[PDB]
């Protein structure tokens, strides 16, 4: 967990060493709504993620999309692919098109190349990421 130069902690969550009531580090979490069940691995996990929709300071609001994971070669983000049919009037026919969307994934979700992920919009996480994985299947 502490793999960085800085100490990872959930901000403004305080663990009083003097009291030492409970062995487990106090963990703060929230439910993102939309009937998206907050996974228990977030509730009883040990990761720290500022961009996780359940334990981070990021709120899901706006469009909700679905896609198929196409790449998972980077850290805590994935590239999904959304396909559709584009209409060409000159030949009166539809042709297959696709768009690649980079989506942040919280470590509470385990995704492989090919699974179907439902994602929710959030504030700009990085240069290109504007969506957050909220359900896997």
């Amino acid at each position: 967990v502490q793999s960085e130069r800085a100490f990872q902690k959930q901000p403004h969550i305080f663990n009083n060493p003097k009291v030492k009531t409970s062995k487990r580090t106090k963990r703060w979490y929230k439910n993102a709504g939309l009937g998206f069940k907050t996974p228990k691995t977030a509730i009883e996990g040990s990761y720290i993620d500022k961009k996780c929709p359940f334990t981070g300071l990021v709120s899901i609001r706006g469009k909700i999309l679905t896609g198929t994971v196409v790449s998972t070669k980077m850290h805590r983000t994935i590239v999904i692919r959304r396909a559709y049919l584009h209409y060409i009037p000159k030949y009166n026919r539809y042709e297959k098109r696709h768009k690649n969307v980079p989506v942040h994934v919280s470590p509470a979700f385990r995704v492989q190349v090919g699974d179907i992920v439902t994602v929710g919009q959030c504030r700009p996480i990085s240069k290109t990421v504007r969506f957050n994985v909220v359900k896997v299947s």
């Binding site: 130069r5 100490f7 902690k9 663990n15």
Partner: peptide, 12 residues
């Protein structure tokens, strides 16, 4: 600094 934070930074 206290607790885990203190121990971590002390290692650092």
């Amino acid at each position: 600094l206290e607790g885990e934070e203190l121990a971590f930074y002390l290692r650092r």
